[PDB]
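hey team, just a heads up i'm posting the complex here instead of the shared drive bc the drive is being weird again. everything in one block, sequence lines first with there labels, then the predicted structure for the whole assembly after. its eleven chains so it's a bit long, scroll down
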Amino acid sequence: TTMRSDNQALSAVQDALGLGAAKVDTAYSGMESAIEVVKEIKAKLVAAT
Amino acid sequence: TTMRSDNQALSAVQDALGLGAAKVDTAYSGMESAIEVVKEIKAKLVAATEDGVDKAKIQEEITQLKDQLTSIADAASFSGENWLQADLSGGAVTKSVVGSFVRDGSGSVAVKKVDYSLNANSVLFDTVGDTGILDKVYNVSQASVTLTVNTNGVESQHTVAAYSLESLTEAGAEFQGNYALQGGNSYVKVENVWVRAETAATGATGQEIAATTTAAGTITADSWVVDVGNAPAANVSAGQSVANINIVGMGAAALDALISGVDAALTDMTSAAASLGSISSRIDLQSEFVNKLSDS
Amino acid sequence: TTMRSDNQALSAVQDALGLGAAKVDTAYSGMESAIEVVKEIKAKLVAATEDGVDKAKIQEEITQLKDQLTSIADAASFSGENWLQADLSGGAVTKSVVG
Amino acid sequence: VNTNGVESQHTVAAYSLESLTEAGAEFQGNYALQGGNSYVKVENVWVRA
Amino acid sequence: TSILTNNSAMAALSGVRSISSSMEDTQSRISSGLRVGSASDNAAYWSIA
Amino acid sequence: TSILTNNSAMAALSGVRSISSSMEDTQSRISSGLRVGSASDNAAYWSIA
Amino acid sequence: TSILTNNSAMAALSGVRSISSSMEDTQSRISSGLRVGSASDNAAYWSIA
Amino acid sequence: IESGVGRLVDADMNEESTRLKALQTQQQLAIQALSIANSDSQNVLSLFR
Amino acid sequence: IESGVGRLVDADMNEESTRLKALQTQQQLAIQALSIANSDSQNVLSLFR
Amino acid sequence: IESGVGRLVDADMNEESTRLKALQTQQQLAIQALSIANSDSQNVLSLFR
Amino acid sequence: IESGVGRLVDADMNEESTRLKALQTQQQLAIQALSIANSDSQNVLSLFR
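-- predicted structure starts here --
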């Protein structure tokens, strides 16, 4: 019975892990977009020097 | 036993909804054909604007297209309820589709229906009155709006000038609800456009009351009625209707008026087609929901 | 004898529980339909927030969807006790299922 | 809006023109005087002044 | 087991009908392009088009 | 699912008919030139030509 | 294997879209010269030109 | 204007192809599940020999 | 967002298939045991005859 | 004259193919139902034995 | 610099193709073995009947 309760807890942890992975993926995509935009800004400014 | 009776009623409603969906599909196909023909007519008229192009050949072109439009209007029927070419003698013909069977909480039973209006913008060649979306003249002026108002219990369409809200608020007007007072002139917000209105008891025809006011500092307390008069600055009407197009030596101004009227008719017909598509979508959703309810 | 009477009462409670479960299932199906329709309404409106889109078409679509919501609300009734479109003049009404 | 010679960014709630005109609001140019409160138009929206 | 009703069967039928409707829609989409249907999709964009 | 009717097939048939008509028109157009090739085209331009 | 989502399919779609955009850009470049686009490239050099 | 209409109306074919494959597979699974549900019913006969 | 919804909502159908087979086997065992339990009560008739 | 004869006589083979597939499916259904109707008459034998 | 980036970043596609084929074969084997492992649990039914 205790092991079954632990298994249920690990299933809940798996769901939480999936949610966190989705959050991290979204944040990383946003970070990549921001990095690309800032690289473009730097290129434009060094052109404008 | 009661639930089985309700399930049988729901099955009957589902069959009626299928029939209505078939009718809507047929009517909408006719509407699409009318859209295509009207677009072709407008393109031909635009090409006719050139003075060097002979107008007779285009004349039989539009004659053939008008006959095609009449064939579209009369042929597009499913079971006698074609949803087009309705009789506008009363001007308020309404057709309905059995939507759902509803049993009220207080031991009552009723049948719900979805209504569709064919008043003046989705009728497609009114049979008797000849006042339909086609075979009627459209007013063409820059700063006016065509408003429908009921007088003595019968509705009518009147063309009156329209005034922008920005000009009203720039001139220093005092507003109240849907009523405005710029000074010696008064305005009422019957629709999205503001229009000059008469105080009261001027027409003496029992016209619909546009708005009611109160003291509000310097506002007269009266029941205001939209001014049936107050013609626009340049009152220009289409020379001929869509079903009576005749371009033999009309002239430039008549051609422009005809083009504007054709475009207005096309816009109204497109709005009617969009409404028909929305009705079809609602029928589909209602059928799916009725199926779910019957399963439950 | 007392336990037999209690068993009969429990059988009646089981029948009532089945009836209540059917009522709740019907209400929940109608509730999902209403949620989907409202989501469609919100999508249409956020599409229409642009000024380049004629608002009459959106207005008529929203009118149709509101009629659909009204029909769903008044039709999702199992046995009169529909758990929807109640009377809130009193302030609060509580529906009970025999547990 | 620049309080002084230097510009700055400010956030202020916006009020729809219909809400003002419904409650009997006097207007003059870009001014609204619905009640005790006074509203003005900055570019396209009416805000409290 | 109830011999007169099969609620799992009704659920399967509902799923099949939903998949069939979506499939018919996507066949129309793949056979005639038109991301926006004849008029049964969002009417405003169809009218603009 | 009905084995007596196929709405998707009917829509595909109408689409195929439209493509066939347009392709035949363009095939005549490419074979013979003459954007206004017959009276079935713009009659006024045909008469002027 | 999830039957309702295919993350590899979305990644492939994103790659295809990027390649298509780059191909259209380079096609314009190879068809009308103009290393600097109409104005969608670096604005300053286009203005000077 | 024609490009604008195309942007507003056209659909990318790859995504529709992915949807078509997914819906075909979902239909196959739904039909198999419905067959299993139908075959579930007649197992009760073993009690009545 | 769609990928996150998929990972949070979709199910890896392989273990559902395994569970379906396991429940079919369990139901078959249960029906057999129920038939045996129904039949075994007839043994008492031997004494009274 | 030959074009008119072809228009009056020839058949748009696509809908004939659709009808051929539909009739194949209908025949399969009819054969299955006919076999079921043949088989169902043997149920009466249980009573007399 | 571009050559160095390509050398550090690009992948020799031939071995990726080989891995793709190998993983397809491994997935086929895994699916077959999983089907066998799902099916083999039904053997117990013989004893009880």
